[PDB]
Amino acid sequence: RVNRCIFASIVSFDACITYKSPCSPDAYHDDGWFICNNHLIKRFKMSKMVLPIFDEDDNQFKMTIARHLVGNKERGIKRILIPSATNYQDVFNLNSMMQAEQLIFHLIYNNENAVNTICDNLKYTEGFTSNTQRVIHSVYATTKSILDTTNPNTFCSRVSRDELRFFDVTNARALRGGAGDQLFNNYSGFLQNLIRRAVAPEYLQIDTEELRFRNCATCIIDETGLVASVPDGPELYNPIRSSDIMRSQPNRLQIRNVLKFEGDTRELDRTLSGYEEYPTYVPLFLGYQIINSENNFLRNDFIPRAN
Amino acid sequence: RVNRCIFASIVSFDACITYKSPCSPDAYHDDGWFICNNHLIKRFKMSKMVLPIFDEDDNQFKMTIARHLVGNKERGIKRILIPSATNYQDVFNLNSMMQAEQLIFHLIYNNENAVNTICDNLKYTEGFTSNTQRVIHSVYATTKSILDTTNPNTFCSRVSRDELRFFDVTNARALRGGAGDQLFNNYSGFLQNLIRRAVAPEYLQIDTEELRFRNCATCIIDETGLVASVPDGPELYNPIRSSDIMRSQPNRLQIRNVLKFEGDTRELDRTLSGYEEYPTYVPLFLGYQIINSENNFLRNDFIPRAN
């Protein structure tokens, strides 16, 4: 009934022109992700999806998982999914989109100086006190109201030190972790919640048993933020297919369409019926997870967690 | 209209007891495989499935791929998918099933001595010449009629040397291959066709472009046949779930159901709607493929192929 996306309250606070809100209907779900899918695929290279864990005794249990939207020939900056604090202002080219987007992003990355600069650049204009002040305060309040819940510290911490989620394999039966954990713990609580819900483990630990869902990692935590780079090998094929983009003619991309497949393949598809198609898009997979015996996985209330 | 599975012609040539034929309806498809899915999952640890390849210019192209039916705690013999000539009679305990099954398996692995022994053991019985003679010729003729088509040599070879399928990564832009290729070329044409349609490459080569579908291998070619052992790590999780088994109560397995998941997770599934479920089962993925420029992939007529 109520939207639960940070970008859902985006407003072009000129008080004259209306504003957009392209959030998909899944934003209203209490899934734990606080970004609508459209904003997830437009702002970052991610896409919500679910990973179901089965058994032999007919039991269902599912955990969320993200997906790449990056291709092959894109290298460097274009491979970045969630840039870190140092490398976000350059990759989001913030002087292009709306002012409220800049405010939201600067709140996300704890850049208070940018917030003050946008506020005092807004202040000098005519008609600020009419509606701009109240609208910018409403946007700020909504962003804070979404940011605090994801934050672990807050006023009174509802933190559950149960799911030891380490994005590394060093002393698996311990709390020892590499610099990846230090980099991951350097994000805002919203960022940590998003990256925790986005990437699913390839090794899992419940009670005393060990589970495995992949053989090699897919992404890696870097100083340039979360980057979709396969370790030790050429980048994985990703067909991109269809995704939304800002189409208002500011500038056009070259794209340089890598594949065309000019041949005809109607008969081959016709002769192969439903065989559980198993789509070949590349999902995220990184890290080692440990679950304590006492913990529960049915806490629908969004709890930031901490390892 | 006509079944294209070897095991579809299985008949208990006693002329008194009726015969079984549990092939699924997909056996009648001209999909390239020559084993019904039911026999595929009952005799070997495979299950047919398809894998579509996309582009950016709205084109479709799909190739076959097999699936594991092996769990985690199974080690050694139970990890064997398609046993080789040396290690097939021990793993298939051939003295337990029907005689015709033994004949088929001995024809598959070019064990002519076993064929002659089964024939001259059948010869001495009463009523052999009445109908058992013609039934054993019927079974032999059908098995040979399926075996020769997959065979490359035969009478006149319809072999195409365009697809270079290497189950190794050594001198990718060359014909050099490791011992895996030598072991693979030691199988019957039926076996080669099955393992060619079962495992899909992790790198693909069309013209000059390089494609990728996995970051690390899943199975490995051994002297003990095709064994489903992931390299460099613990065995992958596989729920097994529901599969057919010989249900006549001769003996009962311990199974030792590994997971039970006593917890309740109805609400967690309720709060997550359709999010591209992405099933987490383990498919086969091994080898490097090269496609020449002029080759075609719409040949409905099955061709054994040779690298």
Numbering used by the authors:
A (entry chain A), B (entry chain B): 14 to 320
Paper text:
Local refinement of the main helical cylinder in the AcMNPV capsid resulted in a 3.2 Å resolution map for the major capsid protein, which was sufficient to build a de novo atomic model for VP39 directly from the density map. The asymmetric unit of the helical cylinder is parallelogram-shaped, containing a VP39 dimer (VP39A and VP39B) with local 2-fold symmetry. Asymmetric units, which contain two VP39s, are related to each other by a rotation of ~18.5° about the helical axis and a rise of 44.1 Å along the helical axis, generating a right-handed, 14-start helix. The major capsid protein of AcMNPV, VP39, has several common elements to that of the HK97-like fold, including the E-loop linking a two-stranded anti-parallel β-sheet, a long “spine helix” in P-domain, and a distinct four-stranded anti-parallel β-sheet in the A-domain. In contrast to other dsDNA viruses where the HK97-like fold is organized with icosahedral symmetry, VP39, with its HK97-like fold protein, is found, for the first time, to be organized with helical symmetry in baculovirus. At the center of the VP39 dimer, cysteines (Cys229) from each VP39 form a disulfide bond. Residues Asn270-Pro296 in the C-terminal region, in addition to Tyr250, form a ring-like structure, creating a “hole” for the insertion of the “E-loop” from the adjacent VP39. When taken together with the intra-asymmetric unit knot, the C-terminals of VP39 form a series of continuous interactions with an “S”-like shape, linking the neighboring helical starts together. In addition to Cys229, which forms a disulfide bond between the two VP39s in each asymmetric unit, Cys29, Cys169 and Cys132 can form disulfide bonds between VP39s from adjacent asymmetric units. These disulfide bonds lock the neighboring dimers together and are likely critical contributors in the assembly and stability of the helical capsid cylinder.
Baculovirus Autographa californica multiple nucleopolyhedrovirus (AcMNPV) has been widely used as a bioinsecticide and a protein expression vector. The DNA genome, along with the baculovirus basic DNA-binding protein P6.9 protein, is encapsulated by an enveloped, rod-shaped nucleocapsid; the major capsid protein VP39 and some additional minor proteins are known to comprise the nucleocapsid. Here, we show a 3.2 Å resolution structure of helical cylindrical body of the AcMNPV nucleocapsid, composed of VP39, as well as 4.3 Å resolution structures of both the head and the base of the nucleocapsid composed of over 100 protein subunits. Surprisingly, the C14 symmetric base had nearly identical features to that of the apical head, except for that in the central regions. Both the head and base could be further segmented into three parts: an outer shell, an inner layer and a central region.
